[PDB]
Specification:
part of a larger assembly; 7 chains; A alpha/beta (154); B alpha+beta (386); C alpha+beta (95); D mainly alpha (318); E mainly alpha (69); F mainly alpha (95); G alpha+beta (176); B: 386 residues; alpha+beta; 3-stranded antiparallel sheet; 17 helices; 50% helix; 12% strand; globular; C: 95 residues; two-stranded antiparallel ribbon; 5 strands; binds 1,2-diacyl-SN-glycero-3-phosphocholine; binds 1,2-Distearoyl-sn-glycerophosphoethanolamine; binds iron/sulfur cluster; oxidoreductase; Complex I; NADH dehydrogenase [ubiquinone] iron-sulfur protein 7, mitochondrial; EC 7.1.1.2; NADH dehydrogenase [ubiquinone] iron-sulfur protein 2, mitochondrial
Chain lengths: 154, 386, 95, 318, 69, 95, 176
């Protein structure tokens, strides 16, 4: 009953947070720190976060850089093609809320005007370690999901 | 048939996003029409609403692989308009970190070029070296990338005690890392098949198309701004300018690898010739005073107050100042109207003219070659779009 | 090769037997033995080993409970108190 | 007992493929000065399990397919054929001892391109069909040299029975008399399985906007298992062909251990090679086949017809 | 360290070891403790059919020797 | 029989793994080119002559080795001439 | 001064020609590349065990902001607005009035951490070491709103991190 649903949630949550395949939108300088998270010192692959992931095989989108108006429709399209469950990590001030270019005529003031965001990673850029802290924070967010618990009580 | 290239590869990439609209006939590329502006953020307009100091961090975020070199270009332009001179120790520090920045850029340029062509492994080896150089940035400025360290008048702070010893230990082993990279690529027949005779550009065309840096020297043009129009203390260091002979991707790759070796050679002289003294110009109407002075002397407090609110006024005038940035000639056309905010700041990004030549360089090549040609130009769209 | 195997066995003994050895393996994915530098008031334990290369020469084994939260499996970097934050990030040499 | 025997072949294959993914990531990791999976389970031993569960509960991609029949056929053909190539392999005893086992493997592998063709045909995307046609053209091209090389080697064996390759190599590995053919065989298996530096399907689809997966996560995992089952199988076959293991009839398990070790090492060399080289251009790997391997294989096929006759080393027919 | 790659290799090695070991053991179990007879050609098949007749229990692998003379 | 049973199991399992993988996860609610034709045709014509070469391991047992060796070499040479003809006529180009 | 990176004549003597034919046919330079990746397989990796191990940082590191106090507990900030004037991103918003005891103190002090570029100009500009960038970098949040810091949050950051902040300033203030 409730015990079986509770453990199934743990199993599927464990599988999903242990196999987070990211689609990186390397838009600007924040993408450089993202590359350093893949580099040997941090090796995001060792957490199960694969290096190369196709957008249709992805579970998390990382918005790493400034989002311009010219680019916003293309970013939304990639998000819409992501199979679920899908999560968005906003990395850096530009993606978080426009940052240094907040008052620009050509810049989206935060990617959360285009897509829902799960984690906001602050910094300009956030260090590779700060990004990794954010990814680990998303994993614990997935760990708290109770999808089957909610479904059982419907 | 018409075809559009993807915004970016499926692995982490930090060059930005490009919409490449191509015309193909079979395997061959007949037309290339890059559609940019995907990272256009109106930097040049935003600068007009900033003081000269407030605008300096914008230059970290142009070619965001060559941060301190972009800072140097802007600092030199303002110093020229201000008619002041940074102290000798600051100039040596600027050259030292300018060449550390060149190493950072050339690792990114060479290894991501290889990574996009399918040679993934060198990217990982050399980005550990980049991580150690990020630590030098962080130890002088508190930031791994956007240091905002080089400023008009000199540098923000003096090197912490013990930093130069660590830069020596790093430099001592770096040429071995380059050798390992060359072992993987230089003589590899697959690498040579992907680069030799690809994207040939003649010396005459390279000049007329506005090319600079390695895009000129790969074609045999003997030109390097550090040699011909030296700035800071580049006239006081010895190094050789690598020159290509075929004007293709392979020669440009060899030029970049050899430039890394020359950067180590320059860093070695900087570590030994570093002089003592102050690290920013001793003119408190331009460079803020020391914090202890600001908290004790009435004049220092006033000048600190005014430099951080109004900022220094710059005499009216216009300058085009350029440096040999790792990607080529990086310049600023800076217009001062006499106030503390620049009237106009046009940024000359070397990758702008290089990318405009993609259609010319890709003629008679196949689709997979377009990836190689973009890599050999070393394009970052922060500086292209601004 | 036998001396490497001995050091492998020493780690099991150095973590208080198999049960303690397995606990750190599954909590921290690392079974190295270091010198105990100290323990903060929340239960975090700080170790050093200066034969390791720079970066791996200091580490913290997080407490299993902090501020009423069960942190046996769920740990994060914000659990390090500021007085140890400086030492763990090598901003200083003195704990 | 036979149905049990089939299961003791199929199920271990799928588990090996699952854990080849872990091994590939960790071996590539250490050659890249990093670690690879070491959190999900000890030393990453639960990483394949997490990946498997994750992929099968992922939302399935909506299939905008122009042919439902060929859309479901392709993964079935790929996975069924992959499992079928294992049934004549002598390890040291085959599940089915076939007199013409080499021809069976040659004939069954020639059908593998139908899953590539049917999947692209069903994709209902011009970009997917072009990629499928490019992948087929590369596959069939390298089938040519694989067949001729295999025939040349059999002129020292005298038979189409796979178990006879064990007898042929009782004194000496066939890599000694046939290392020029071994080198071209090894590279041809890389190109046949679309492995780096011949991974043009993955390479090209990355560039082209509109050349996507078109299969849901679960069905796409079945394609991946089929591909990796083939990678292990091709390296088991390479070991049998060129590094023959001595068989003791009373201690068959001794053969299995040694032959397993060789197969693992050959499989890891595929990972070793992936970590070391850039990718070929499509026209460049076609030239490698048609203008290099094929001329050399033809001359070596002529040589290996003549050599047993001129040395008086013709093998027995049985 | 590199030897941390071995556990995955060892697991992979075991999975590849099982099919060959199982086939060998199942053959001995089914064939009276001997190798399964190889009959590729009509001669070998004819002798296997004859051995079935001679066994008296309809099993080719049940061998009869001088005791039947 | 054993072979057919093995074939049925392999594809039946493949059919099962595909049917449930196509159906069960649905329960969880939330410019013709002449160059490419000619490589295919060239593969076919080379494949046919590979068919004529397959019996060679059995042909080497003949008492008529003189004829067998001549015809074997003759067949492989005509393959080499076929490749040479395509090569010299730019049938293996991509530009 | 310049040098040629690729201007060499291959020797055409038979020995040299046969060295190149051996390289072509026997893949010697490809084998050499395999040697390099094999040697890396047996090197200790550079990976650290985050979050149990951390990347090294210096006292100058620019992290999360905090508002500081004097040893007596009085706020250091006297609402001069130099940080707000210099901020390149206009991330700082300040209002001030005379405090009930007559002190010059802020009634609003906001930092929009999603506008901020983490440049450290505010702490350079501050004349009384009131606003600093602390050493913390692990403060990612689940909502955008959590990154709009008001004065209470910044004072709480100061009280939370003062032990580390004070030591870092002690380490670097003679370079300023
Ligand atoms: C098919 C069989 C599936 C086997 C399930 C394997 C689960 C293993 C596992 O959860 O690891 C322990 C995990 C590991 O804990 P963790 O993943 O939360 O964190 C481990 C510590 N770090 C991340 C710092 C390294 O324990 C759990 O968190 C509980 C989840 C249990 C899921 C199994 C459901 C039954
Ligand atoms: C091999 C191929 C087969 C592998 C198995 C893959 C298929 C597994 C079954 C998945 C469908 C289950 C249907 C559940 C229906 C349901 O309760 O609603 C979903 C509910 C939906 O939530 P909801 O009902 O509250 O609605 C959501 C809100 N709306 C509708 C508005 C969007 O929960 C889920 O979404 C998660 C369901 C996860 C199902 C987990 C099944 C048990 C664990 C599976 C382990 C798989 C092991 C794989 C082993 C490795 C591969 C062999
Ligand atoms: C007594 C008389 C007896 C008669 C017989 C005598 C024989 C004498 C001749 C012996 C030498 C024959 C060698 C045959 C091997 C094939 C050689 C070959 O094809 O190499 C050429 C090919 C293309 O090289 P390229 O530089 O482009 O040449 C210019 C072409 N226009 O280059 C390549 O193929 C390179 C392939 C690139 C991909 C390689 C990636 C992996 C490489 C490492 C694997 C090492 C091999 C491991 C073998 C394992 C076997 C189990
Ligand atoms: C150049 C780089 C290579 C790149 C290509 C990749 C090649 C990888 C090669 C992997 C296989 C190498 C051989 C593996 C060694 C394992 C040997 C073993 O386990 O058994 C011992 C064996 C000798 O015994 P055996 O093989 O049975 O010979 C009897 C003749 N029939 O063996 C004795 O030593
Ligand atoms: C040890 C005893 C012997 C000792 C002495 C040595 C004797 C043997 C060596 C002498 C043999 C003669 C050498 C013949 C090779 C030279 C042929 C040649 O030069 O062709 C090269 C060239 C193709 O090159 P490519 O760049 O691809 O295209 C042309 C662009 N210029 O031009 C072409 O267009 C090539 C077109 C023809 C290619 C022929 C392909 C034949 C097919 C392979 C058959 C191999 C033999 C039978 C099997
Ligand atoms: C594989 C493991 C790594 C081995 C170490 C690499 C090495 O030492 O080889 C380098 C050696 C020198 O070759 P190179 O520097 O390119 O100069 C031209 C030829 N002297 O080059 C060599 O000696 C490699 C020789 C390779 C021999 C051919 C292998 C054929 C495999 C099938 C048998
Ligand atoms: S937040 Fe900073 S580092 Fe990131 S893209 Fe914007 S300016 Fe660049
Ligand atoms: S760090 Fe820079 S951008 Fe951030 S609040 Fe201070 S002055 Fe403004
Ligand atoms: S924080 Fe410092 S600079 Fe900013 S208003 Fe307060 S006293 Fe002035």
């Amino acid at each position: 009953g409730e015990y079986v649903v509770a453990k199934l949630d743990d199993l599927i949550n464990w599988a999903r947070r242990s196999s987070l395949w990211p689609m990186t939108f390397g838009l600007a300088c924040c993408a450089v720190e993202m590359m350093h998270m893949a580099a040997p010192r941090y090796d995001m692959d060792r957490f199960g976060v694969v290096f190369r992931a196709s957008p249709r095989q992805s579970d998390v989108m990382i918005v790493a850089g400034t989002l311009t108006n010219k680019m916003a429709p293309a970013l939304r399209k990639v998000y819409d093609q992501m199979p679920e469950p899908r999560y968005v990590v906003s990395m850096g001030s530009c993606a978080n809320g426009g940052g240094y270019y907040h008052y620009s005529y050509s810049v989206v003031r935060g990617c959360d005007r285009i897509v829902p965001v799960d984690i906001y990673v602050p910094g300009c850029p956030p260090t590779a370690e700060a990004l990794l802290y954010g990814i680990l924070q998303l994993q614990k967010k997935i760990k708290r999901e109770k999808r089957l618990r909610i479904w059982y009580r419907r | 048939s018409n075809l559009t290239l993807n915004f970016g590869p499926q692995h982490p990439a930090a060059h930005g996003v490009l919409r490449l609209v191509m015309e193909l006939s079979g395997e061959m590329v007949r037309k290339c029409d890059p559609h940019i502006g995907l990272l256009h953020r109106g930097t040049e307009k935003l600068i007009e609403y900033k003081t000269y100091l407030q605008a300096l961090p914008y230059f970290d975020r142009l070619d965001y692989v060559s941060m301190m070199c972009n800072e140097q270009a802007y600092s030199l332009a303002v110093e020229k308009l201000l008619n002041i001179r940074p102290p000798p120790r600051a100039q040596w520090i600027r050259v030292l970190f300018g060449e550390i920045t060149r190493l950072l850029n050339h690792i990114m340029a060479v290894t991501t070029h290889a990574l996009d062509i399918g040679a993934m492994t060198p990217f990982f080896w050399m980005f550990e070296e980049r991580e150690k150089m990020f630590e030098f940035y962080e130890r002088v400025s508190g930031a791994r990338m956007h240091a905002a360290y080089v400023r008009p008048g000199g540098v923000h702070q003096d090197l912490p005690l013990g930093l130069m010893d660590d830069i020596y230990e790093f430099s001592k082993n770096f040429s071995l890392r380059i050798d390992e990279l060359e072992e993987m690529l230089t003589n590899n027949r697959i690498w040579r098949n992907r680069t030799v005779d690809i994207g040939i550009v003649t010396a005459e065309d390279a000049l007329n198309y506005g090319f600079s840096g390695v895009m000129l020297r790969g074609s045999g043009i003997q030109w390097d701004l550090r040699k011909t129009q030296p700035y800071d203390v580049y006239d006081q260091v010895e190094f050789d300018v690598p020159i290509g002979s075929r004007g293709d991707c392979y020669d440009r790759y060899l030029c970049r690898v050899e430039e890394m070796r020359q950067s180590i050679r320059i860093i070695s002289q900087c570590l030994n010739k570093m002089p003592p003294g102050e690290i920013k110009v001793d003119d408190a109407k331009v460079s803020p005073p020391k914090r202890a002075e600001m908290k004790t002397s009435m004049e220092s407090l006033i000048h600190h107050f005014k430099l951080y609110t109004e900022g220094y006024q710059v005499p009216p005038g216009a300058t085009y100042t350029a440096i040999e940035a790792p990607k080529g000639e990086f310049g600023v056309y800076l217009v001062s109207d006499g106030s503390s905010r620049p009237y106009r700041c046009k940024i000359k990004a070397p990758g702008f003219a290089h990318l405009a030549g993609l259609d010319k360089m890709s003629k008679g090549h196949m689709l997979a070659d377009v990836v190689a040609i973009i890599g050999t130009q070393d394009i970052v769209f922060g500086e292209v779009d601004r | 090769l036998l001396q490497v195997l001995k050091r492998g066995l020493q780690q099991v003994s150095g973590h208080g037997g198999l049960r303690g050895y397995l606990r750190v393996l599954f909590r921290a994915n690392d079974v190295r033995v270091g010198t105990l530098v100290g323990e903060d008031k929340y239960g975090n334990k700080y170790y050093e080993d200066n034969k390791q290369f720079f970066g791996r020469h200091r580490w913290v084994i997080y407490t299993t409970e902090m501020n009423g939260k069960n942190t046996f499996w769920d740990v994060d970097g914000s659990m390090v108190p500021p007085e140890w934050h400086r030492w763990l990030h090598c901003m200083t040499d003195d704990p | 007992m036979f149905m049990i025997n089939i299961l003791m072949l199929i199920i271990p294959i799928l588990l090996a493929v699952a854990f080849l993914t872990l091994v590939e990531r960790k071996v590539l990791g250490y050659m890249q000065l990093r670690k690879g999976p070491n959190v999900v389970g000890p030393y990453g031993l639960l990483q394949p399990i997490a990946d498997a569960i994750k992929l099968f509960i992922k939302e399935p991609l909506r299939p905008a397919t122009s042919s439902a029949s060929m859309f479901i056929l392709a993964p079935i053909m790929a996975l069924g054929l992959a499992l079928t190539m294992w049934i004549p392999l002598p390890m040291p005893y085959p599940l089915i001892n076939m007199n013409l086992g080499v021809l069976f493997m040659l004939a069954m592998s020639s059908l593998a391109v139908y899953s590539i063709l049917w999947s692209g045909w069903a994709s209902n995307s011009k970009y997917a069909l072009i990629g499928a046609l490019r992948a087929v053209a590369q596959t069939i091209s390298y089938e040519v040299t694989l067949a001729i090389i295999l025939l040349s080697v059999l002129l020292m064996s005298g038979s189409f029975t796979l178990s006879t390759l064990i007898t042929t190599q009782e004194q000496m590995w066939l890599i000694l008399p046939a290392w020029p053919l071994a080198m071209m065989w090894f590279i041809s298996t890389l190109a046949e399985t679309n492995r780096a530096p011949f991974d043009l399907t993955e390479g090209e689809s990355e560039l082209v906007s509109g050349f996507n997966v078109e299969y849901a996560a679960g069905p796409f995992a079945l394609f991946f298992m089929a591909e990796y089952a083939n990678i292990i199988m091709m390296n088991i076959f390479t070991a049998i062909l060129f590094l023959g293991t001595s068989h003791n009839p009373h201690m068959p398990e001794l053969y299995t251990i040694n032959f397993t070790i060789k197969s693992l090492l050959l499989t890891m060399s595929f990972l070793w090679i992936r970590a070391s080289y850039p990718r070929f251009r499509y026209d460049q790997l076609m030239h490698l086949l048609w203008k290099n391997f094929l001329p050399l294989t033809l001359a070596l096929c002529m040589w290996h017809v003549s050599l047993p006759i001129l040395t008086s080393g013709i093998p027995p027919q049985t | 360290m590199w030897f941390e790659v071995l556990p995955g290799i060892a697991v992979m090695g075991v999975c590849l070891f099982i099919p060959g070991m199982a086939t060998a053991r199942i053959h001995r179990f089914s064939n009276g403790g001997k190798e399964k007879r190889v009959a590729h050609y009509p001669y070998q098949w004819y002798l296997m059919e004859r051995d079935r007749r001679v066994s008296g229990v309809n099993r080719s692998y049940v061998s009869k020797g001088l005791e039947n003379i | 029989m054993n072979l057919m049973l093995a074939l049925l199991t392999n594809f039946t399992l493949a059919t099962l793994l595909v049917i449930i993988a196509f159906w069960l996860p649905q329960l969880n609610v939330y410019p013709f080119s002449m160059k490419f034709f000619l490589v295919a045709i060239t593969f076919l014509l080379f494949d046919l002559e590979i068919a004529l070469l397959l019996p060679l391991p059995w042909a080497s047992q003949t008492a008529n080795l003189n004829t067998m060796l001549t015809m074997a070499l003759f067949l492989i040479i005509l393959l080499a001439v076929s490749l040479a003809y395509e090569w010299t006529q730019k049938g293996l180009e991509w530009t | 001064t310049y040098k040629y990176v690729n201007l060499r004549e291959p020797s055409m003597d038979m020995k040299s020609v046969t060295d190149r034919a051996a390289q072509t046919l026997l893949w010697t330079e490809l084998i050499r590349g395999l040697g390099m990746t094999l040697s890396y397989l047996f090197r200790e990796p550079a990976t650290i065990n985050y979050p149990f191990e951390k990347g090294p940082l210096s006292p100058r590191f620019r992290g999360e902001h905090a508002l500081r106090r004097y040893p007596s507990g009085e706020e250091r900030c006297i609402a001069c607005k130099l940080c707000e004037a210099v901020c390149p991103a206009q991330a700082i918003t300040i209002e001030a009035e005379p405090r009930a005891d007559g002190s010059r103190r802020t009634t609003r002090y906001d930092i929009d951490m999603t506008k901020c570029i983490y440049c450290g100009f505010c702490q350079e500009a501050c004349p009384v070491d009131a606003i600093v960038e602390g050493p913390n970098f692990e403060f990612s949040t689940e909502t955008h709103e959590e990154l709009l810091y008001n004065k209470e949050k910044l004072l709480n950051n100061g009280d939370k991190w003062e032990a580390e902040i004070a030591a870092n300033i002690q380490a670097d203030y003679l370079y300023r």
